[PDB]
Amino acid sequence: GCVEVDSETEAVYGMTFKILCISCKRRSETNAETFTEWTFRQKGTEEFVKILRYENEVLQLEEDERFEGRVVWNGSRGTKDLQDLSIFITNVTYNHSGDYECHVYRLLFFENYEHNTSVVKKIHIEVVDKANRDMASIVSEIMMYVLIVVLTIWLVAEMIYCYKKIAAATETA
Amino acid sequence: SMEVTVPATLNVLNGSDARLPCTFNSCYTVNHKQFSLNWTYQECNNCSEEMFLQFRMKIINLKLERFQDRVEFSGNPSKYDVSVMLRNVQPEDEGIYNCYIMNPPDRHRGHGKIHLQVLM
Amino acid sequence: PGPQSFVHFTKQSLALIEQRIAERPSSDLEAGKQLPFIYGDIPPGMVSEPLEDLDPYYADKKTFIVLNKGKTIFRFNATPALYMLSPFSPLRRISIKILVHSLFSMLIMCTILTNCIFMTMNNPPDWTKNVEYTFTGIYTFESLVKILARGFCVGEFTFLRDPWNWLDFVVIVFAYLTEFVNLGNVSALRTFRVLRALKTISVIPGLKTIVGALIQSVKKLSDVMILTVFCLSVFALIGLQLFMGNLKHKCFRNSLENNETLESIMNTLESEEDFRKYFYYLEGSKDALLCGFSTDSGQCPEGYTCVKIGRNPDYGYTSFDTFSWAFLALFRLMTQDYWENLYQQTLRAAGKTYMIFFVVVIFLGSFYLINLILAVVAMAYEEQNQANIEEAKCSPYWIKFKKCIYFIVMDPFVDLAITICIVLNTLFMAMEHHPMTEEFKNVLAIGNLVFTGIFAAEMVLKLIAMDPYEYFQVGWNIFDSLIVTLSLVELFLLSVLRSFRLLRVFKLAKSWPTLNMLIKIIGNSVGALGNLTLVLAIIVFIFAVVGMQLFGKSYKECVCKINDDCTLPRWHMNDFFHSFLIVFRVLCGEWIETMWDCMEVAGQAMCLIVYMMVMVIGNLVVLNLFLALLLSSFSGKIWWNIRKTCYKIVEHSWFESFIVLMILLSSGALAFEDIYIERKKTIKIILEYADKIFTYIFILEMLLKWIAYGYKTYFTNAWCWLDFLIVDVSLVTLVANTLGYSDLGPIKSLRTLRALRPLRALSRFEGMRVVVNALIGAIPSIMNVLLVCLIFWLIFSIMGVNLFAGKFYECINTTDGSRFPASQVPNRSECFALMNVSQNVRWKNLKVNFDNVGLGYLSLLQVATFKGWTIIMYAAVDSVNVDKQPKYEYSLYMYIYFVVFIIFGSFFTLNLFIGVIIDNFNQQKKKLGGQDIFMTEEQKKYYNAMKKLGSKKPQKPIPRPGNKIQGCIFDLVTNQAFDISIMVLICLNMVTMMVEKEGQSQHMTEVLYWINVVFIILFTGECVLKLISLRHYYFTVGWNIFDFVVVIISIVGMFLADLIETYFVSPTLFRVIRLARIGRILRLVKGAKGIRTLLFALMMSLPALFNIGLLLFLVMFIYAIFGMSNFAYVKKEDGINDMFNFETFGNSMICLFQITTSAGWDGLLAPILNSKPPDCDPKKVHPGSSVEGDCGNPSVGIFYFVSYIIISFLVVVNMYIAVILENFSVATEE
């Protein structure tokens, strides 16, 4: 089923970037009618500006110059029960760096009931020039190499020790 | 026939209170919209029936002139009870009292008949 | 002993008899037994006459005996019949002469058989009054003649001294009460007329001994029933304290208008629609969705809060609210009937953490107690059978043609030719499916014709060679003639008849020894145990007609409580057929689903009485029959230095333990690879690199093992071969990953073989090595019996395909999923028009049916494991034709096909299974020096030192202290009256814990609190009293140590309740602490020796069960990883809900423990089978993942679930049973 996976927090200059905002229902069987809005502030600036509003089927974006001609939808297609509100930036600039907020306006449908939920997903991304490898990846790689080398040295140490012992046992025979 | 328990003959002293006790029993659980109870009086065996109390979503007391305001409901129908009370019974109250109970979903209609006799 | 020796009953002889009484048993001559051959034949002038008593032990008393033509003995008293008629009187003479007669016996038998035929009418016509009058008259007449022959209450051998006449008396008394002035309960009085069907138990020969043997077996089952009640009660108190009111959770609304409150609603709403308008009610269920406060149990949809309010699920009968309902739910878990629904409901209500409670309850209560009942019934029957056995012991042209026919009948080759023809005809009839082109149909038809012609020619040749007389003298030949007649009748002149040639395959029995064993079982069912199967049939009939008479009035009257269309449900008791089907379904373990409906319509008291009588009685007899059948069946050279060093390294215990730890780590690193692995990317990375570390370590271990053992010693070892295979697969995967250009097809499909990495633990853990050795030793008989079962179910599945091939299609309406009324849209042609007109209709199959023989095998697996059979039985009995809309119970008698299948396939073949498997385990136990085959060596040492505890030796009681008041205390403590007083106090604490319930008064809770306080006070007082008595030697008894422990735990439970009340707030942990007081109850097994023996048997079987549980846990782990790999992302259709799916390791191991008892495996498999839309979606999005499609592989799903069923059968139903049986024998013998 759905997985609420956090978005990547490191966009690279001049290339593409998909900002994940995944807000799936607490019960998958219910049928809702979801639309979303995205707000954004550049780094070093203190307000929030709506950039695009996705609706029943079409994506309407505000007339800010920062995101004109370089934003396309990436969430669920043709569902009308969106359950995944993921914006895709093409040709990221140095202005797509700051705090994004993914407002999810879900309207569930029940027997005699129409609930109006609103989960706010906040994504902070920073644009850079070169893809920086994760500290987790680099430290786990060097740790794997260290463990492999330590196991090799332990094995050869025990090997040469038992070899000297076997040679000493054979010398007496 | 529906299981309705009433005394076939009920003998009451003039001036006392007469509880007309009837037991209706059917499967299922009673429904307020669903459960309907009707009580009628007759002065004699062949005499026209006069409805004097009904249950239709609640008790309706028809306040027949012949009873003044002496009729009261005296039963909790959810208990299969639909008894009525006739306060301060008078000689003219002698006659036949009929309880009719129709209970959805039960198709069958219960009927209890009491012959009330007034002593002296 | 001489023919002249016996003398007719004369007054002169009786005059001597009375004198011997005035002066003051031979089993061979017992009444009813056959007269021994020693006395020879009876002269015709003395038969059916009173004779002098031949037994001198009885000859003193006033008795006499009358002989039947068949040499049976009948004993009567010589007194006048009710002080009226002496034996010399003429009336009593003719009365006895007609009493002792096979004509009269068979008259009564046929009369009560016709009465049993008439009892099943369920709405008899007007004229049955004179039939019942005739039956009552015949009964009164036979009772009258036996009264005239014996005497009512006067005498030693009077009519009443034997109990089987009490029933004949009661039945006529009740019949005449009914005819005369009768009470108001006409139906509950007509129910009492069923004892006419018990009359045959005494009329028919032998049934009177079979029932006596059953009553003897119950006398042994007594102690296991006591322990069953005690264990169900202890686990019911635990389940009560845990889930009191948890089943009452319901996800309630949030936005209430008109100031409407929870209570203001609950007091005013009662209809299910009004309920559904406020609570969740998940789209088609009768009860609201269970909710949860705890994080794991979950989850109610946005806009709904969790609150415990309303009625419990399943009309109110599925709950742990009161102790009675907790006991009923734990009996439901102990008989494992629909226990998967209770599993899922209480887990959703409380949390997925209580899988621990359900594992304990199943793996102790259900399995251990059922295997204890089996072991005790087995021991009882075996000892009874052993005791019985020991105490018992043209014409010339015609002759030329016949010679030539015998010469060409070629015995050494024609028998084999006909066997090959039989097998070919079977494999030719098994090549039939629903969608068949006309060429295929014609091929099948001409093949059937050719085969039936071959068999007819062979039969006529054999007849003319051996002829009509000596030929038909043989059973197989008369059987083949019957079959060839049944096949030739349809040459040019029904398919149930057509499916009868398959029985010819039993001609393999003369060559196939295990098929011969199956024939022997089926024949012992109607032979040596024919009387026992007749008792079973009579009991099933009695219970069926009793259920009918008691509940068929209400069912018809009050259908709406148990159904929404106000029509009869699928399983009712309004007809004799459906009543019998319900009794059969309760013989199988499926009692509760119908007990709920029958309770709803006809009262809990009556339905509980009837269903518990059915369950207990009918299961006991069935169990006895199963046991009887099964038992009866049994009886420079630097390279060499390098090799030595690396061999020492490999054999080093440090290296062995390190490799075991790395195996455990590499196995546990698979549990993290679920759908939530896109999150926790750091753990994802450390796993992606630990994978390479582990692959390298295992490659180095393999190279060390090579250089240390040599290719010979290495590849001559199955464990090393398994390790080599797993490491080679891992190396292929690593090389592909590191080289690239490999993310396609085979590589991605062998990456999931990483689920086999746990298999490296078998070679290391001795507790799994021993179990795997035992199973691998047993596997040849498994193969033989699986082959026999395959051929038998092939017969049944060819029949099933011929009957239900392509008739399961229906016009479901996809919104609610309800068959169209078949008045409109009667066939597929109109269904397609309705599909053009509307959107939500779909001509859909069942996905598990008899469309071909493979699907037939699957449907039969479901019908024979009883988990998923109702959905097939319904559509079968509704089937009409090949392309017609099914009508509601239009066939209604393929229920007979499924009953016959269950009885033969499931019962008999599973009996063959258990028998051959326990027999193979006994052969292995013999071959291995007689020591147990499920324990390692350290476990065997532990087991011997533990069996030492079974000593009956009385130890030195105590040295009494010299101090006077201390010795007074010592005596008052050592008093047996004091001991029994403590026992009764424990029983009073037990009922104090039982009286609790959900929704009790605050005053009641306070009184129970203070009663518990006084109980703990008394217990601690007697403990410190025994201490002041025996300061030094109190702790030298394990039972006294346990008493000290449990009183400490009780006082600290009170103190912890105090400390929580002060500083903490946690209902769950508070409850689990309060669970401590079950210790104060568990002190009852101290005096109950019959319980203390079976508990010692369990303590004996604990190590072997630990090894079997280790193997089962490793198999469950491998299958859980295979699940998380394949069956994640599948559609959530049924049984694969939000909870209990295959998404993560928790959910996968939960579903797998559910399936470990075979429960609900049909529901778990159903969403996987669907593919090829519109049954699924092959390109879904799954937000948060890159995998598309939400349907699983049908083939891999069938293989997964069927292989897990078979494996967890082998391991859990045939090794748990074997361990329990051997260890219980060990316990009870010494």
Ligand SMILES: CCCCCCCC/C=C/CCCCCCCC(=O)O[C@H](COC(=O)CCCCCCCCCCCCCCC)COP(=O)(O)OCCN
């Ligand atoms: C928290 C625990 C979770 C459960 C995990 C599953 C583990 C399975 C546990 C099974 C418990 C089985 C222990 C039974 C031990 C009782 C044996 C016993 O008392 O025998 C006696 C041995 O003496 C002792 O060892 C005393 C030691 C105290 C034992 C405490 C007994 C507690 C009973 C627990 C009940 C078990 C479950 C019952 C239903 C929940 C002597 O035998 P005998 O009376 O002379 O009879 C010989 C006949 N020829």
Ligand SMILES: *[C@@H]1O[C@H](CO)[C@@H](O[C@@H]2O[C@H](CO)[C@@H](O)[C@H](O)[C@H]2NC(C)=O)[C@H](O)[C@H]1NC(C)=O
């Ligand atoms: C299949 O069943 C659904 C309901 O179970 C039917 O839907 C109903 O249709 C009628 C008239 O078409 C409406 O008045 C109801 O309001 C509908 N109910 C619901 C719950 O939607 C549907 O019509 C059925 N299919 C066909 C072909 O009749």
Ligand SMILES: *[C@@H]1O[C@H](CO)[C@@H](O[C@@H]2O[C@H](CO)[C@@H](O)[C@H](O)[C@H]2NC(C)=O)[C@H](O)[C@H]1NC(C)=O
């Ligand atoms: C399948 O069912 C349909 C509808 O009942 C049958 O339709 C026939 O043709 C028209 C269509 O309604 C009717 O006027 C005829 O009376 C129907 N024939 C009969 C015998 O009822 C159709 O015959 C059925 N069988 C098929 C299509 O093989």
Ligand SMILES: CCCCCN1C(=O)[C@]2(COc3cc4c(cc32)OCO4)c2ccccc21
């Ligand atoms: C082809 C052989 C298929 C195996 C059939 N199979 C069962 O029938 C049960 C399901 O129903 C049971 C009821 C019991 C029992 C075992 C089972 O032992 C105690 O009572 C089971 C549990 C685990 C693996 C297999 C099975």
Ligand SMILES: *[C@@H]1O[C@H](CO)[C@@H](O)[C@H](O)[C@H]1NC(C)=O
């Ligand atoms: C992004 O746009 C710039 C021009 O503004 C262009 O030079 C560059 O090639 C583009 N990059 C991609 C990946 O489209």
Ligand SMILES: *[C@@H]1O[C@H](CO)[C@@H](O)[C@H](O)[C@H]1NC(C)=O
């Ligand atoms: C990004 O911001 C800078 C200064 O803040 C501005 O000069 C530039 O025009 C912005 N980008 C676009 C596409 O307008």
Ligand SMILES: *[C@@H]1O[C@H](CO)[C@@H](O)[C@H](O)[C@H]1NC(C)=O
């Ligand atoms: C997101 O949009 C891009 C087009 O800019 C497309 O190539 C990509 O497939 C989309 N992603 C998803 C998941 O649909």
Ligand SMILES: *[C@@H]1O[C@H](CO)[C@@H](O)[C@H](O)[C@H]1NC(C)=O
């Ligand atoms: C409530 O729903 C309306 C549309 O029905 C929407 O415009 C509004 O934003 C929603 N508000 C919240 C808090 O969800």
Ligand SMILES: *[C@@H]1O[C@H](CO)[C@@H](O)[C@H](O)[C@H]1NC(C)=O
């Ligand atoms: C519906 O009927 C039309 C003819 O009117 C036919 O062309 C079409 O194939 C049909 N489709 C279905 C789905 O029945």
